[PDB]
């Protein structure tokens, strides 16, 4: 497993935060959205071909811009933060350190 750093293209029309967050880094946010465009061929490559494609609507762009390609499908990633109950097991083997939760 590895940690990766990836770019986000068109942030102004892709990233939407919880309206209740007011800090610069959006630390006090509970959910967020991140769109990216996709093609029907790649939409069929992953997921499944059986269900037709339904895309998100924003009515944001085409504001003074010519459009010709209707082969874009808008998919978004949804992030949530939850407070959940988890059981921690404390292995207290004395050999090579004892306290280990």
């Amino acid at each position: 497993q590895r940690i990766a750093i990836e770019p986000i293209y068109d942030p102004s029309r892709s990233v939407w935060f919880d309206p209740d967050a007011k800090k610069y880094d959006k630390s006090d946010a509970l959910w967020a959205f991140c769109m990216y465009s996709l093609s029907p061929e790649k939409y069929e490559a992953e997921y499944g071909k059986k269900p037709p494609t339904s895309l998100d609507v924003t009515s944001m762009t085409s504001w003074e811009y010519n459009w010709f390609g209707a082969d874009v499908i808008y998919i978004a990633k949804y992030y949530e933060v939850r407070k959940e109950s988890v059981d921690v097991i404390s292995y207290r083997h004395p050999i090579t350190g004892e306290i280990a939760t």
């Binding site: 059986k50 037709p52 339904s54 609507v57 009515s59 085409s62 010519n66 459009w67 010709f68 209707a70």
Partner: protein, 414 residues
């Protein structure tokens, strides 16, 4: 009254349930430039058996192999066009976006209205008297019971009803005796649950309506039709002639009317045994496809959907206890010329739906608009030199009916 705001006032909208229920999987990218304007699917096979003390099958005819077809075709164009003076349009409406919002919903609404019309025109099954509305719990569970009795298992079964009917069902649910969650939900939100009576219930306000069409007299069949499997292995449609009608009436039977044959009963398709509705056997019914008039002498010839197959050389394909023959008595459900909004119940594999992508027109700027999974091709051109800009929206759907015996109309009964 010189200052006018940018924000357009809100309007009225319909609801979309028909497109989300029908099968859009089998018919998807199948009508291409190579196939043509129609494509066909296969049909399942059925077999019969011989019982003898010793298995001498020497002279008895062996099962013959007959293959069926189910064709889907393309419809007309869903076209909406406007013309205007572009300088007057650009007075306070820039980017030509004010028109985009209320046009895609119009296109989708017309598409689904035609889809509902096709569904109610090609459905076969009928339940209850048209006059009586839906009030109680049994009026919904009857459809599920009938579908289970017919034998359809693979696939999901759906039922659609108008807004007022749901209120009545929720009001009835508020009178329950032991379910706390159901009572509280019906009291607060007035929302009926997902599975109601074993069938997935849905509500919709935008639902097509039909008019009965004047008829009268004791109708009866005049000539024995041809209901062998060879005749109806490609369309599941048959043409029959009637007598005893009124002298000369135009529009004697409208599209969507149900013609019921009294003495011919439904059969459980696998076991080939007659159907008993607890107290009375269920009669065979069919739906008029196109409008028909009556000529002098009271002779009406009509085309019906749903065929009473009683082939005598291929018994394995029968679906009716006895053959329809001359002199039999028929009846038409409903009142003379009343208007009602029918309620639809159907299986997943009853009707299909698809759309044909349209190429960009040469030397003309265009764009593609998407709404609820449908693609709209819009074109702009400047024909006429009188400051006459023109815009048009296009969409081309495709319909198919697999088997008429898994859908139709239903009402409440007393």
């Amino acid at each position: 009254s010189q200052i006018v705001l940018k924000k357009f006032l809100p309007g009225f909208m319909s609801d979309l349930v028909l497109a989300k229920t029908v099968d859009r999987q089998l018919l998807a990218g199948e009508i291409n430039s190579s196939t043509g304007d129609s494509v066909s699917f296969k049909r399942p096979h059925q077999f019969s058996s011989l019982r003898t003390p010793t298995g001498d099958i020497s002279g008895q005819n062996k099962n013959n192999l007959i293959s069926g077809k189910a064709t889907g075709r393309v419809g007309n164009y869903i076209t909406v066009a406007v013309e205007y003076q572009q300088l007057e349009e650009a007075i306070k409406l820039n980017q030509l976006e004010e028109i985009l919002a209320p046009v895609r919903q119009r296109i989708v609404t017309d598409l689904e209205t035609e889809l509902a019309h096709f569904m109610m025109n090609n459905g076969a099954l009928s339940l209850g008297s048209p006059n009586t509305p839906i009030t109680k719990w049994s009026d919904v569970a009857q459809t599920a019971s009938f579908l289970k009795d017919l034998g359809v298992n693979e696939g999901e079964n759906y039922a659609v009803m108008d807004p007022w009917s749901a209120q009545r069902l929720a009001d009835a649910q508020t009178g329950l005796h032991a379910s706390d969650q159901l009572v509280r939900t019906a009291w607060e939100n007035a929302q009926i649950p997902t599975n109601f009576g074993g069938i997935r219930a849905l509500m919709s306000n935008g639902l097509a309506s039909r008019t009965q069409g004047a008829f009268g007299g004791t109708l009866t069949v005049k000539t024995q039709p041809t209901v062998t499997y060879n005749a109806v292995k490609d369309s599941y449609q048959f043409t029959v002639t009637l007598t005893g009608a009124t002298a000369s009436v135009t529009g004697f039977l409208k599209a969507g009317d149900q013609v019921k044959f009294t003495n011919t009963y439904w059969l459980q398709q696998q076991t080939k045994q007659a159907l008993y509705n607890g107290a009375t056997p269920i009669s065979f019914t069919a739906t008029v496809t196109a409008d028909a008039n009556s000529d002098s002498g009271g002779d009406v010839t009509v085309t019906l959907s749903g065929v009473p197959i009683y082939d005598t050389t291929n018994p394995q394909y029968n679906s009716v206890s006895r053959q329809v023959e001359a002199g039999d008595a028929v009846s038409v459900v409903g009142t003379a010329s009343q208007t009602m909004k029918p309620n639809l119940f159907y299986n997943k594999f009853f009707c299909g739906l698809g759309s044909i992508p349209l190429p960009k027109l040469h030397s003309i700027d265009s764009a593609v608009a998407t709404y609820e999974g449908f693609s709209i091709r819009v074109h702009k051109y400047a024909d006429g030199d009188a400051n006459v800009q023109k815009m048009r929206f296009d969409l081309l759907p495709a319909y198919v009916c697999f088997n008429p015996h898994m859908g139709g109309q239903f009402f409440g009964n007393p």
